[PDB]
Structures are given as C-alpha cells and as structure tokens.
C-alpha cells in the first residue's frame, strides 16, 4: 500500500538506495552485509505489494515495516549513554527511540582510500557492491546527511570511476574529482545538520522564519502567498528527512521541483536552465540558483509598518502573519544582508510591538523602531571587514592560529580535538568569502559561521563541560554568533597543570604531510594556551617562532632524535 505507492513513484533503483541509507543511519554499528541483506528482502516485498496492494501484509506502515526488519538484527545495545531497548517498544515509541539514538560522533575509524589501481579493479569487478559501500560508509558517519542529495553525490561518484578508470593517467583524472566531491559532501552535511537542529531544538516556527527570509531574497518578484506556499512545502520535506522519513522526503522533494518549474513566471527568471535537467540534477540546481533581480520601484516600508495608526490592530489580528509579511518585505529588498541578521531585525521589531501596543500611545512609542536596526546592521559589517583584513595579511594557516588562540581563551574547557577542528573550519571563512565584493560578503560569511557554530553546539551537547557554551548555544538560535563574539577570557578557569610529554619531540614530525604537521603544531598551541590563558600576543609570538625554528633545525641535523630531545629542553626552558 504505502510501500507500493513509494516504490512506483521513486523507481526501484532510488528506492533501494534510500532504504539502505535509512538503515545505516538508525543502526550505525551494524556491518555492511546485514544491511544489504535486509534491503533486498524489503524491496522484493514491495514488488509483491504493487502487484496486489491488499495482499499479504502490504497495509502496514513504513515505520512498522522497517522497524521490524531492523529489530531482527538489533543487539539490546550497551554503548548509547543511558539507553533503553527500542526493539522492545511499540510504535510510534519504537521509532521515537530510534531517532534519539542517532550518534553525531560515532567511534568509527577514519577511512583511508586504497591505491587508485585497487579501487578501479574493485569497481569493474563488482560495480553494484562498490557503489553501495560508498552510500553505507557516508550514511553511518553522517546520520543527518540530506538523503536525496546523497543520491546525487553517488551518481557523480559513479561517473568519475566510469570515465577515469579508462584513461592514460587514471590517478590524475580521478583524484581531482574525488577530492572535490569530498569537500562538497562535507559542506552539504554541515548545512543540513543546522536545518535538523532548528526543527528539533527550536521548533517548526524557527525553521519557517528562516525559509521565509531565504526564499524572499531569492525570489523577490513572487507574491507573498506564493512565497508562503513554497515555505510550507519546503518545511514538510525537511521535517520528514530530519525525522528519518526518507522515502516520503525524497518523493515530496521531487514534487516541489516540478511545481516550481511549472510556474517560473510567478517565481523567478533564473530558473530556465535548472528546469531542463534530469531529476536529481534539477533539484540540486534549483536549491542553489542565484538571486533573481528585485522588482524596480518598491515603496518604503514605513507607511505600513511604522507610520500607520492601524499597526497594532493588524498585528493583533494575526501576529505571525503580520511578522511574516514584514520579514518578506525586508528580505526581498536586502540580498546584501545575512539571513541571521534579517531574523534579528524581525525579532527586534516584534519585541517593540509587544511593548508599545500595550503602552498608552503606541504610535509615539514605536515611531523610531527602524533606528534600532542601524547598530544591528553595522556590527556584522565591521566584524567581517576587519576579519578579512586580518585574513589577507595572515594567509589561511596563520589566520586559523589566531582564531584558535581566541576560542581557547573564550571556552578553555572544550576538548582539544574539538577546538582544533572548529577553529580550522571557522578560518576557512576567509578563503570562502573575502574574495567577494562588499555587497556579497555578509550572507556568505555570517551564515557560514552559523553553520560551523552549530557543529560546536551539537558536539558539546553530547558531553557537556562548559556552561558558557551551553548558554550561547541555547539562549537564542539567531544570536549564537553575537553571543560567542562577546565572550573574551573565562576568568573562572584554573590553568591546566604542566605536562612534559605534551610538549615533547618525535623526529618523525619530519616526513609527515603538510596537513598532518600543521594539525600537530595547532594541537600544541591549544595546550600551551590552556596552560597559560593570560599569555599575551607578544609572548605567544616569540614561542611559536622559536618552535618553528626548532623543528626546522632538528629535521636536517645529522643526529635527529638527539637534537629533538636536547634542543627540546632548551625550548621548554626559554619562557
């Protein structure tokens, strides 16, 4: 029934892929072979169902059906914090349990890829199995990956092997395509992780506000009713994907692309090329199409939202409709603002109507709202202008180091591995955004930062250690980035005790690749700051410069290990 409805709509090939992804994300520790085994059973059952929709057992729910297949290879768990057995429950409690057990940082080994020759031989040997392993390793390491987009990655992944495994220089053709795909997947997963956190932690109203603002910037010409309809459909898609309901998410997404391509005249002029592509491409394209041109002569927003005398009445009739219209009007006129800034303005506006419409003369009370926005607009502009200046004189690696010192001082209780990863990711904002013109810099920079800080929040939620992180993460979704910025030095922190091993040698620091050696030095920097949180910019400078010179010296020495040991104590001594 419902299983037949989705098979028919999606076709067997996408169906099988989506079921495999769902299984791997619910049971992240189960081996490849078992999942393949269960997906195949479910698929052939599905076929019996479209043959006779009232046959056997075709009328069960998708939750029930996949729940049962899963529970035949459960295990009664052990490592999930403080958990109960889901497979011992009844729906929808069973499904609820599954979802809350999704692990954002599973203890799985980093995947190192074999020689180009091995991969190609494996691909030509068993193509079906090679491609399913790709889906399975990604899906279990990224439990919130956007399902229909993973299908698009895997289609491109297949395309690279098919073409390059038959070239003169295979490695030279394949690696640049794999490396680019891996980078794309990482950013993709981080954006989606922020969408699910919004729906799950802050609620449906939070997500819908984000979408009203975003789509208004992109489709400035569309009426408000057309915008709202799109927001409503897009919100259903992400609610199903974020809830683990992947088949319907995929199906509903396909439906929205086609509604949109059927109504370009009422939405945007930038949609033609996107709307001629194959299924999976078309949606990927439409999701990232450029902002259309804003309608010519838009009136000032003052008459309707601040000057009029009916403001309080129109608002009180339906507060969220009135605030939604306000966000739509402001956003479509400001493609040069980040979406977090637009939401901050709309919230400032709400706060002022709540206070003023209860005062004795509201008109007088709210007459100057728009004046409150100017400080809020300027803050993000100055920050970015300055950070890009710094980035441009430091270059990426050293910009990263500057941010690492800053954050380790703000929140010194956060683990070192977590701090290094987050600081590195924040520093990539320079490379990604500073190249753009000024009227294009804030959306790029400020919304990217929001994605990276969400990562910090979801990691920290799993094992809390800092009440300052907890506060900035939960007080306000939209004010997260201003909240961390205002933090300085954690005055209550007791400096970490000196540890000699932590600041010792290796001799094999030589022969390490670039990436690895910078990682190694950045870890040492984090620990040095934990040891001496009030050491200045000038003191830290001298010590790093001394370190860099110490390493250069000992890698070309005749007796390297002796140099590392003995020139090491001298470095330690100088302080």
UniProtKB/Swiss-Prot annotation:
Changing residue 78 to K: In Vibo Valentia. Keywords: Calcium, Cleavage on pair of basic residues, Copper, Disease variant, Disulfide bond, Glycation, Glycoprotein, Lipid-binding, Metal-binding, Methylation, Phosphoprotein, Repeat, Secreted, Signal, Zinc. The record marks 195 as: Aspirin-acetylated lysine. The record marks 16, 37, 60, 69, 89, 102, 132, 155, 170, 177, 186, 191, 201, 208, 236, 258, 270, 282, 355, 368, 385, 398, 410, 428, 432, 462, 471, 496, 515, 520, 534, 537, 553, 556, 560, 570 as: Not glycated. One of its GO terms (biological process) is cellular response to calcium ion starvation. Ca(2+) 1 binds at residues 2, 240, 245, 248. Glycated in diabetic patients. GO terms for molecular function: antioxidant activity; copper ion binding; DNA binding; enterobactin binding; exogenous protein binding; fatty acid binding; identical protein binding; protein-folding chaperone binding. Changing residue 350 to K: In Hiroshima-1. InterPro entries: ALB/AFP/VDB, Serum_albumin-like, Serum_albumin/AFP/Afamin, Serum_albumin_CS, Serum_albumin_N. Zn(2+) binds at residues 63, 243, 245. Ca(2+) 2 binds at residues 9, 251, 255. It is found in: Secreted. It comes from the Eukaryota. Changing residue 265 to G: In Nagasaki-1. The modification Phosphothreonine is found at residues 79, 416, 418. Its main location: secreted. The modification Phosphoserine is found at residues 1, 54, 61, 269, 415, 485. Changing residue 309 to N: In Canterbury/New Guinea/Tagliacozzo/Cuneo/Cooperstown. GO terms for cellular component: blood microparticle; cytoplasm; endoplasmic reticulum; endoplasmic reticulum lumen; extracellular exosome; extracellular region; extracellular space; Golgi apparatus. It is linked to Hyperthyroxinemia, familial dysalbuminemic: A disorder characterized by abnormally elevated levels of total serum thyroxine (T4) in euthyroid patients. It is due to abnormal serum albumin that binds T4 with enhanced affinity. Binds water, Ca(2+), Na(+), K(+), fatty acids, hormones, bilirubin and drugs. Its main function is the regulation of the colloidal osmotic pressure of blood. Major zinc transporter in plasma, typically binds about 80% of all plasma zinc. Major calcium and magnesium transporter in plasma, binds approximately 45% of circulating calcium and magnesium in plasma. Potentially has more than two calcium-binding sites and might additionally bind calcium in a non-specific manner. Interacts with FCGRT; this interaction regulates ALB homeostasis. Interacts with TASOR. In plasma, occurs in a covalently-linked complex with chromophore-bound alpha-1-microglobulin with molar ratio 1:2 and 1:1; this interaction does not prevent fatty acid binding to ALB. This is Albumin. It comes from Homo sapiens (Human). The gene is ALB.
């Amino acid at each position: 029934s419902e299983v037949a409805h989705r098979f028919k709509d999606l076709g067997e090939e996408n169906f099988k892929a989506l079921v495999l992804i769902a299984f791997a994300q619910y049971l992240q520790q189960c081996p490849f072979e078992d999942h393949v085994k269960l997906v195949n059973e479910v698929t052939e059952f599905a076929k019996t169902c479209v043959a006779d929709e009232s046959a056997e057992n075709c009328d069960k729910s998708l939750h029930t059906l996949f729940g049962d297949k899963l529970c035949t290879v459960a295990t009664l768990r052990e490592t999930y914090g403080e958990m109960a057995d889901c497979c011992a429950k009844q729906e929808p409690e069973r499904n609820e349990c599954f979802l809350q057990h999704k692990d954002d940082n599973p203890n799985l080994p980093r995947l190192v890829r074999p020689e180009v020759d091995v991969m190609c031989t494996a691909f030509h040997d068993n193509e079906e199995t090679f491609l399913k392993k790709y889906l399975y390793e990604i899906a279990r390491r990224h439990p919130y990956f956007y399902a229909p987009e993973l299908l698009f990655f895997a289609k491109r992944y297949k395309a690279a092997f098919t073409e390059c495994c038959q070239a003169a220089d295979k490695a030279a053709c394949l690696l640049p395509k794999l490396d680019e795909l891996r980078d794309e997947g990482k950013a993709s997963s981080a954006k989606q992780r922020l969408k699910c956190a919004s729906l799950q932690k802050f609620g449906e109203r939070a997500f819908k506000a984000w979408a009203v603002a975003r789509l208004s910037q992109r489709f400035p010409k569309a009426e408000f009713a057309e915008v709202s309809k799109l927001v409503t459909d897009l919100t259903k898609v992400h609610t199903e994907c974020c809830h683990g309901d992947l088949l319907e998410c995929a199906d509903d997404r396909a439906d929205l692309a086609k509604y949109i391509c059927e109504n370009q005249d009422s939405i945007s002029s930038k949609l033609k090329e996107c709307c001629e592509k194959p299924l999976l491409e078309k949606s990927h394209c439409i999701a990232e199409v450029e902002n259309d041109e804003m309608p010519a002569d838009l009136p000032s927003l003052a008459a309707d939202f601040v000057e009029s005398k009916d403001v309080c009445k129109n608002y009180a009739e339906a507060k969220d409709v009135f605030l939604g219209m306000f966000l739509y009007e402001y956003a479509r006129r400001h493609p040069d603002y980040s979406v977090v800034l637009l939401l901050r303005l709309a919230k400032t506006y709400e706060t002022t109507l709540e206070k003023c419409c209860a005062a004795a003369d509201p008109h007088e009370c709210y007459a100057k709202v728009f004046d409150e926005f100017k400080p809020l607009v300027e803050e993000p502009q100055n920050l970015i202008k300055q950070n890009c200046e710094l980035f441009e004189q430091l270059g990426e690696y050293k910009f990263q180091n500057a941010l690492l010192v800053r954050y380790t001082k703000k929140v010194p209780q956060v683990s070192t591995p977590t701090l290094v990863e987050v600081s590195r990711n924040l520093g990539k904002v320079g490379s990604k955004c500073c190249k753009h013109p000024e009227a294009k810099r804030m959306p790029c920079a400020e919304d990217y930062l929001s994605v990276v800080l969400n990562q910090l929040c979801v990691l920290h939620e799993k094992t809390p250690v800092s009440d300052r992180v907890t506060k900035c993460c939960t007080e306000s979704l939209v004010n997260r980035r201003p909240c961390f910025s205002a933090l300085e030095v954690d005055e209550t922190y007791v400096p970490k005790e000196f540890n000699a091993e932590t600041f010792t040698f290796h001799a094999d620091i030589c022969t390490l690749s670039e990436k690895e050696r910078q990682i190694k030095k950045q870890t040492a920097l984090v620990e040095l700051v934990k040891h001496k949180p009030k050491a200045t910019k000038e003191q830290l400078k001298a010590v790093m410069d001394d370190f860099a010179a110490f390493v250069e010296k000992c890698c070309k020495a005749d007796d390297k290990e002796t140099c590392f040991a003995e020139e090491g104590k001298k470095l330690v001594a100088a302080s």
